[PDB]
Amino acid sequence: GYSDRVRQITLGNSTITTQEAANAVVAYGEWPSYLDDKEANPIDAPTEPDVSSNRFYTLDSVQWKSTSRGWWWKLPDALKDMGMFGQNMYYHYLGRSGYTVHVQCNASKFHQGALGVFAIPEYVMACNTEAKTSYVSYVNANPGEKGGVFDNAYNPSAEASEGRKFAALDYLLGCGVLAGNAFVYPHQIINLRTNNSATLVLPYVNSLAIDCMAKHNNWGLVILPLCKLDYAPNSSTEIPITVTIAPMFTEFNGLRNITVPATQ
Amino acid sequence: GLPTMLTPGSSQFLTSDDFQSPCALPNFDVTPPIHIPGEVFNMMELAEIDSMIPMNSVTGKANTMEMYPIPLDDKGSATPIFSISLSPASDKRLQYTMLGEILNYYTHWTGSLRFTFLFCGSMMATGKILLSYSPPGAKPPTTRKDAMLGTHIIWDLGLQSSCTMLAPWISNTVYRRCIKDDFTEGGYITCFYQTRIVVPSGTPTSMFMLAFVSACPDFSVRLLRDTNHISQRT
Amino acid sequence: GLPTMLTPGSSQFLTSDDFQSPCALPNFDVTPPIHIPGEVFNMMELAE
Amino acid sequence: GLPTMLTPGSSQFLTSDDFQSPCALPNFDVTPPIHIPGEVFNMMELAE
Amino acid sequence: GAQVSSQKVGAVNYTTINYYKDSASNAASKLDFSQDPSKFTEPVKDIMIKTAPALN
Amino acid sequence: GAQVSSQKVGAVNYTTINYYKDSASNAASKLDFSQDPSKFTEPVKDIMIKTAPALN
Amino acid sequence: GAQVSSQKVGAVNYTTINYYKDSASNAASKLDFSQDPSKFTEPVKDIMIKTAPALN
Amino acid sequence: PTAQSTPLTSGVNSQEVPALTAVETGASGQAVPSDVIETRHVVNYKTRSESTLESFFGRSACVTILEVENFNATTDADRKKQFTTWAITYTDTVQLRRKLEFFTYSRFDLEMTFVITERYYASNTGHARNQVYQLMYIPPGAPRPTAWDDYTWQSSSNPSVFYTYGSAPPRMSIPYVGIANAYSHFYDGFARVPLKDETVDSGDTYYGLVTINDFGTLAVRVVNEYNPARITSKIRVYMKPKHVRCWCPRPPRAVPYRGEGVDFKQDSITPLTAVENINTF
Amino acid sequence: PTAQSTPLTSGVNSQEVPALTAVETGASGQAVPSDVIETRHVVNYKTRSESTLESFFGRSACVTILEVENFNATTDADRKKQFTTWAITYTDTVQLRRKLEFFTYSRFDLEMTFVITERYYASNTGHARNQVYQLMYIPPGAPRPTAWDDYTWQSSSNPSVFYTYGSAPPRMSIPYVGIANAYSHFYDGFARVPLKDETVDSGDTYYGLVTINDFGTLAVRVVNEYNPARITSKIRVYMKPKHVRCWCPRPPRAVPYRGEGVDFKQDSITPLTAVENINTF
Amino acid sequence: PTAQSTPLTSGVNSQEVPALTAVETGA
Ligand SMILES: CC(=O)N[C@H]1[C@H]([C@H](O)[C@H](O)CO)O[C@@](O)(C(=O)O)C[C@@H]1O
Ligand SMILES: CC(=O)N[C@H]1[C@H]([C@H](O)[C@H](O)CO)O[C@@](O)(C(=O)O)C[C@@H]1O
Ligand SMILES: [Ca+2]
Ligand SMILES: [Ca+2]
Ligand SMILES: [Ca+2]
Ligand SMILES: [Ca+2]
Ligand SMILES: [Ca+2]
Ligand SMILES: [Ca+2]
Ligand SMILES: [Ca+2]
Ligand SMILES: [Ca+2]
Ligand SMILES: [Ca+2]
Ligand SMILES: [Cl-]
Ligand SMILES: [Cl-]
Ligand SMILES: [Cl-]
Ligand SMILES: [Cl-]
Ligand SMILES: [Cl-]
Ligand SMILES: [Cl-]
Ligand SMILES: [Cl-]
Ligand SMILES: [Cl-]
Ligand code: NA
Ligand code: NA
């Protein structure tokens, strides 16, 4: 009865079902966990918000078209305005979190296409001016739940002030490496003939036990069309991709007044 | 003092030497280690991971995302679907795979190579595809009837989306060289329609598959060297 | 003599090195120690 | 350092010397040996 | 405090003594043949048996 | 007369032999973690218990 | 890990310690007096006894 | 431990189908030759010794070339040629950098070695006595020299090495000195959070590791006073990571670097050479 | 173990005839003196120590002479004099080669030693500071330098040795690096099979070991920048096979070599000096 | 020997007042 294709995930007051999964990935074979006393750093008693924040948040959906070049988000950035997770994040200097990432994309037995879904630690991307290096604004680096898109062209700006955004060039993974090698990162593929969802469980990954969430994204989430969407009755059709992410084993230190980042 | 006598080598700086040396920061207290996920111990662990072959790196597709997908259709042509030499370090398409990149830091390689193919047509598309590896020294195969005389697998498209073809280690030398070299040539990998891809109406008649390559557990490399894939002006 | 081979670093003067060296005043009889109040062992004692 | 004193011969290259030397390719995995017919151990075998 | 260890074979032991008080001064770490490719090649939640269907 | 001692850990022992007849010739003294901050931070005649009033 | 071996006689032992982790670094192989000239001087299928006729 | 031996196997006619899988799962292909062909037994005695991280990184690699001179300097520009300072990094060169960047995080001790060379600037100004060099490591915060003979070179606390020209290349070990539990080769973030309505500039700020990294400064001088003959020197700096651990593998750099970041250059983003046809052996 | 002692023997009158044999069998003569004369007992204490393979090959032999220079080069030809590359081989010289070629196959580690010498090109251009040399081993596939100061010399992975002029001859060991189970000194074959009706050239192809051998390249430079005085250098390369095994003996080279192959030269194929008569003592 | 570890503690509501002292004492 039980199947690699059928799964339920419950976190807090939220549940996901899928009937066309393809197993699930646990990044680097490690489930998330709380921070042990023998690896701890800040000494204040941490806040562990548990069910208030460790639950599925669904981002705004994006549309997959035959011409789409792909999508990216950063974490914890994409969830910074999500319910109590966002509040706990911004009221504290320090935070750590794992995640369950559930990417959703159904179609029909007559559609075709394949999405690579990658979780990338320290997903540093190229800037869009050749007058400077590492020249990206905080606002452009941290788009929140809307994330960003890849392009198949690189057109760096005439003036440095206009190029302070990522050059998200698809085939170089926005960072000067070949996209065909992205499979070294934890990943699944949503191949429409096979499955309609990808599930990745991510431990906290960093060179520190805990860090400043508002300064530093631990993971990138990349969705790249490896094989373009095609549908014979209408090649211009679009199908939604929906991203739903739950923080897990969240832990926060250094409580004070709320952080309100710059918006422009 | 203890009588001693200096030998050849004295005072040289060999960049692959392995000697002790005084510490510039004595009794320094290093930051305690913590567990970090994803520890790597051997570059061969990375070589065993599948990465995509840019199989369709033809003019207009090379250096775009479209270099990866291998064109398929429902026409059942007798022409090969793709053809590539087993030269995993030096071939224009294999050199930039993860395996290829690792191989270009070494001079010698040995072992079996795994080629895994993912069919990305619609669920309604069926088909049978022949994947072949022909060890070297004979006419390179350009027809199915020659290809099928070599090592091969007939892949039936279906619920299980992917098929693995092996290029088993079959070599005169114990290691091959990580360069283009007649003496350590590896042979020929080809692919043909065994039947054809068939679709019903209202279904795309052209589609793609993705090809991945990885090393098997019998695989190893030797003789560290600098790669020709990175450089700088001086 | 014992065959030997000099390695990199030979003859350098690293100011944080920690080697032995010959004494310029051999068999010198140092003044005996006595107890003095206020001995310090670690700069962190002073930081507290 | 250990007090030492260089003797005559120091730094010479005698072509019939027999010393150790650092390996340029450390932890290199040599090709395993196999049996080959006709092994020779001494030039006097050939003289016979 | 001499350590005697096996050499890497050539065409059988060697001796090491550490001369310095800081481990940072030591020569290269001994060969570590540890590996676990599956954390990268098969990081799946549910065990996959090769001979079985990947999806059932 | 070799002394074998623990090294300071890096990213485990080392050997020392003294070559000279004067202790002044020796390398650095071994790490001494002794301390008693209270002779400077709390040199009071009557014991002060933190949780108690300093002056009663 | 010192090896003590007989010297080649002159007109009686010596000591060797290997300093390197690769056997390729080692000094010359020890004298090997092995020989079997007959594989070249008498590689015949049927035994030939000197005192007997070579052909009978 | 050795790489895998191959077992003796024949054929099959079976409901067991190891040739098929589904890489949508995130698993790579797993099948080996015995799964899809008839194999003989082959004992594999070969090892992966030379691809351990210690073996892969067990080389002293040049990471920069510094220049210093010794002559009678009478201008500010020429006075600044009598010593040099260099922010310690591995990004001046590409080879070691690319190898390290197979990984996201690392932890290692460092062996640093130096190669020092000289030439005469001219032949009509006599000769020059053998030179001694001082290479001083200035940790972040320690005062940096503004002249080759200022007070900073007394180096009471900073480590310095005094090197005599013609002697063996000097060398020292450095512990793992990171303020985190590993070094980060990539840092997807900033050094501070810019806040709502603050007056701090947001137009000229940077991103990533460059905003947070600081391994101090190497300062080099010729200790000798000037001769009539001007001598110009190069100091090549070599790094070997040892006692190495690394985490979180990455695709390697596929296109030229153009600085300390991950940025790429518009005229150099086409690494593949196009093949004539998909069927080209 | 010693060479054979001689037993006390007298005469014989016997049907045992050790003096006769039949070398048609492929057996060499076997008789010894005691078989054909009256002998005294002589104890033989002498040994064949110096004709073991290790003893026969236990010498560092010069295998090539390389040249490099250091001066201000303003032409392409002169720029190419600032470094040199050499395909590693033992066929530039004749002595070690001939000894190795007593055998068909071998297996050994190598000790490589170098002797580096300089002279002034001229006397009216001042002097030159002491030079450091870099000798870089470039395995097959690694990028080869096109200039003395290009990026390849950073040598992150290739082994390099930096040698300071006047220091002891530098030296390193190389393992047995063959991709077969032994080195072949002779290879009766080709690198590929030419096939029926192929368009590949068959008129300018080669034969034997030259078609398959590649032990990489040695690249040498002077690391120093130019002085006013041009310095020219020679680098002599020495090889000693150690830990030696050999198989399948061969007649030794009887006439001069004329290249890397077994070819001979028409004016040099008469090694014997004719004797006056068959009866010449 | 190491620098001081930090123990797990919660809050208090107590006549024990370690936050107050009198540095006039020389402590
Ligand atoms: C670095 C350099 O190029 N130096 C060159 C100098 C200078 O150009 C002039 O002395 C400066 O006026 O000139 C020479 O002819 C010399 O002095 O022997 C050759 C020397 O190599
Ligand atoms: C290699 C060589 O033969 N060099 C000789 C040079 C050059 O021929 C000229 O300087 C080039 O014009 O001339 C000398 O008289 C000199 O300069 O003292 C002697 C020197 O040995
Ligand atoms: Ca709680
Ligand atoms: Ca010595
Ligand atoms: Ca299966
Ligand atoms: Ca109190
Ligand atoms: Ca007889
Ligand atoms: Ca089988
Ligand atoms: Ca000076
Ligand atoms: Ca007799
Ligand atoms: Ca030069
Ligand atoms: Cl948001
Ligand atoms: Cl193109
Ligand atoms: Cl000073
Ligand atoms: Cl002076
Ligand atoms: Cl081509
Ligand atoms: Cl360089
Ligand atoms: Cl120079
Ligand atoms: Cl005669
Ligand atoms: Na094995
Ligand atoms: Na005898």
Nearest 5°: phi and psi at H49?
A: -60, -40
Contact present, A76 and A211 (Cβ < 8 Å):
no
* Residue I202 burial (CB count, 10 A): 8
Q: 């992966």: which residue's tokens?
A: H48
Nearest to A201 by CA among A29, A26, A21: A26
Task: Render the burial of A41-58: b for 16+ CB within 10 Å, e for the rest.
Answer: ebeeebbebeeebbbbbe
Can you tell me the distance from the alpha carbon of I247 to that of I225, in angstroms, rounded to the nearest whole number?
A: 48
Ligand minimally distant from the alpha carbon of residue I151: 17
Give the DSSP per-residue string, E37-56: THHHH--BSS---TTS-S--
Contact present, A115 and A190 (Cβ < 8 Å):
yes
Contact present, I114 and I243 (Cβ < 8 Å):
no
Q: How far is CA I118 from CA H102, I127, I160, I169, I221, in A?
A: 43, 13, 20, 14, 13
Chain breaks in chain G (C to N over 2.5 A) after: 11
Q: How far is CA I50 from CA A28, H116, I54, I213, in A?
A: 60, 45, 8, 31
Can you tell me the distance from the alpha carbon of H99 to that of I153, in angstroms, rounded to the nearest whole number?
A: 16
Pocket test for ligand 2, best of I67, I69, I123 (most atoms within 8 A of CB): I123
Contact present, E4 and E13 (Cβ < 8 Å):
yes
Q: Which atom of ligand 1 is nearest to the CA of I225?
A: 1
Q: How far is CA E28 from CA A79, B222, H52, H109, I158, in A?
A: 44, 18, 12, 10, 18
Q: Which of C1, C2, C16 lies nearest to residue B24, judging by beta carbons?
A: C16
Contact residues for G38 (Cβ-Cβ < 8 A; gap 6+): none
Question: How near does any CA of chain D get to the CA of H221, in Å?
Answer: 27
Q: 């032994």: which residue's tokens?
A: I182
CA I21 to chain centre: 40
Can you tell me the distance from the alpha carbon of B62 to that of H273, in angstroms, rounded to the nearest whole number?
A: 7
Q: 């030492």: which residue's tokens?
A: D4
Q: F50 a known binding residue?
A: yes
- Read off the DSSP letter of residue A216: B
* Residue B231 burial (CB count, 10 A): 17
Residues with CB under 6 A from ligand 1: H 121-124; I 72, 125-126, 226, 228
Nearest to I116 by CA among I173, I170, I59, I172: I170
Can you tell me the distance from the alpha carbon of I213 to that of D25, in angstroms, rounded to the nearest whole number?
A: 19
Nearest to I107 by CA among I183, I174, I27: I183
Question: How near does any CA of chain D get to the CA of H132, in Å?
Answer: 22
Instruction: Tell me how many helices (H) and strands (E) chain A has.
Output: 2, 13
Q: Which of J18, J24, J26 lies nearest to residue F43, judging by beta carbons?
A: J26
SS3 H97: helix
Token readout for H219 is: 């300062």
Domain E1-56 carries which CATH code? Answer: 4.10.80.10
Residue I237's Cβ-count burial label (10 Å; 0-12, 13-18, 19+) is buried
Sign of CA dihedral E9, E11, E17, E21: negative
Cβ separation of E38 and A29 shorter than 8 Å? yes
Q: Is C12 on the interface with D (CB under 8 A)?
A: no
Cβ separation of E11 and D29 shorter than 8 Å? no
- Read off the DSSP letter of residue F29: P
Nearest to A49 by CA among A88, A9, A96, A97: A88
CA A106 to chain centre: 19
G and F make contact (3+ CB pairs below 8 Å): no
Residue H179's Cβ-count burial label (10 Å; 0-12, 13-18, 19+) is exposed
Token readout for I96 is: 């070690």
Q: Which of I110, I176, I243 lies nearest to residue G29, judging by beta carbons?
A: I243
Can you tell me the distance from the alpha carbon of I136 to that of I114, in angstroms, rounded to the nearest whole number?
A: 13
Q: 């670094």: which residue's tokens?
A: G25
Q: Is A21 on the interface with H (CB under 8 A)?
A: no
Query: How many domains does chain A fold into?
Result: 1
Token readout for H39 is: 């194999």
Contact present, B213 and B91 (Cβ < 8 Å):
no
Resolution of this model in Å is 1.6
The domain limits of chain B are 1-234
Residue located nearest, by CA, to atom 11 of ligand 2: I122
Q: 């790094």: which residue's tokens?
A: H239
Cβ-Cβ contacts under 8 Å, J25 against chain F: 44, 48, 54-55
Q: How far is CA H165 from CA A155, F16, H119, H226, in A?
A: 50, 31, 12, 15
Measured between alpha carbons, how far apart are the two ends of chain H, in Å? 36
Cβ separation of E11 and D28 shorter than 8 Å? no
Q: Which residues surround ligand 18, an ion (CB under 5 A)?
A: H 117, 119, 234; I 224-225
Residue H97's Cβ-count burial label (10 Å; 0-12, 13-18, 19+) is buried
Secondary structure E strands in chain H: 20-21, 61-70, 83-87, 103-120, 132-138, 160-164, 171-174, 183-184, 217-222, 231-249
Give the DSSP per-residue string, D4-35: EEEPTTTT---TT------BSSTT--PPPP--
Nearest to A116 by CA among A3, A222, A228, A232: A222
Can you tell me the distance from the alpha carbon of G26 to that of G24, in angstroms, rounded to the nearest whole number?
A: 6
Write down which chains contact chain E via at least 3 CB pairs under 8 A: A, B, D, F, G, H, I
Residue located nearest, by CA, to atom 3 of ligand 2: I121
Cβ separation of A43 and J6 shorter than 8 Å? yes
Q: How far is CA A152 from CA A169, A170, B73, H273, in A?
A: 6, 6, 25, 18
Can you tell me the distance from the alpha carbon of A14 to that of A82, in angstroms, rounded to the nearest whole number?
A: 14
Cβ separation of F14 and E24 shorter than 8 Å? no
Nearest to A57 by CA among A81, A24, A87: A81
Q: Give the helix ranges, DSSP H, for G8-51.
A: 38-41
Task: Please tell me if the CB atom of residue I126 comes closer than 6 angstroms to any atom of ligand 2.
Answer: no
Q: Which residues surround ligand 7, an ion (CB under 5 A)?
A: I 21
Q: Which atom of ligand 2 is nearest to the CA of I122?
A: 17
- Read off the DSSP letter of residue I125: S
Cβ separation of F51 and J16 shorter than 8 Å? yes
Can you tell me the distance from the alpha carbon of I112 to that of D22, in angstroms, rounded to the nearest whole number?
A: 10
Cβ separation of F10 and H109 shorter than 8 Å? yes
- Read off the DSSP letter of residue B26: T
CA H73 to chain centre: 34
Can you tell me the distance from the alpha carbon of A192 to that of I126, in angstroms, rounded to the nearest whole number?
A: 77
Residue A263 bridge partners (DSSP): none
Question: How near does any CA of chain H get to the CA of E51, in Å?
Answer: 4
Contact present, H131 and H205 (Cβ < 8 Å):
no
Cβ separation of I27 and G54 shorter than 8 Å? yes
Task: Please tell me if the CB atom of residue I119 comes closer than 6 angstroms to any atom of ligand 2.
Answer: no
Question: How near does any CA of chain J get to the CA of F21, in Å?
Answer: 32
CA B223-B228-B233 angle, 5° bins: 130
Token readout for D5 is: 């004193």
Token readout for A263 is: 């918006």
CA B94-B95-B97 angle, 5° bins: 65
Residue I248 zone, left/alpha/beta (φ > 0; ψ -120 to 50; rest): left
Residue located nearest, by CA, to atom 1 of ligand 1: H121
Nearest to I136 by CA among I51, I219, I216: I219
Q: I44 a known binding residue?
A: yes
Q: Domains in chain H, start-ordered, CATH in brackets?
A: 1-281 (2.60.120.20)
Contact present, I127 and H127 (Cβ < 8 Å):
yes
Contact residues for A19 (Cβ-Cβ < 8 A; gap 6+): A5, A6, A196
Q: Is I200 on the interface with B (CB under 8 A)?
A: no
- Read off the DSSP letter of residue G22: B
Nearest to I109 by CA among I248, I250, I260, I239: I239
Contact present, H102 and A181 (Cβ < 8 Å):
no
Nearest to I244 by CA among I190, I157, I183, I203: I183
Q: 């452009």: which residue's tokens?
A: A140
Task: Render the burial of I108-146: b for 16+ CB within 10 Å, e for the rest.
Answer: bbbbbbbbbebeeeeeeebbbbebbbbbbbbbbbbbebe
Q: Is H171 on the interface with I (CB under 8 A)?
A: no
Q: Give the helix ranges, DSSP H, for B1-123.
A: 43-47, 98-103
Token readout for H49 is: 């010794």
Contact residues for I188 (Cβ-Cβ < 8 A; gap 6+): I208
Ligand minimally distant from the alpha carbon of residue I45: 21
The domain made up of B1-234 is a member of CATH 2.60.120.20: yes
Cβ separation of B183 and I142 shorter than 8 Å? no
Can you tell me the distance from the alpha carbon of H264 to that of H258, in angstroms, rounded to the nearest whole number?
A: 6
Q: Which helix (H) or strand (E) holds H34?
A: helix H33-36
Nearest 5°: phi and psi at A26?
A: -110, 105
Contact residues for I43 (Cβ-Cβ < 8 A; gap 6+): I5
Can you tell me the distance from the alpha carbon of B156 to that of B160, in angstroms, rounded to the nearest whole number?
A: 9
Contact present, A119 and A221 (Cβ < 8 Å):
yes
Task: Please tell me if the CB atom of residue I121 comes closer than 6 angstroms to any atom of ligand 2.
Answer: yes
- Ligand 18 centroid to Cα of residue I73, in Å, is 15
Experimental method: X-ray
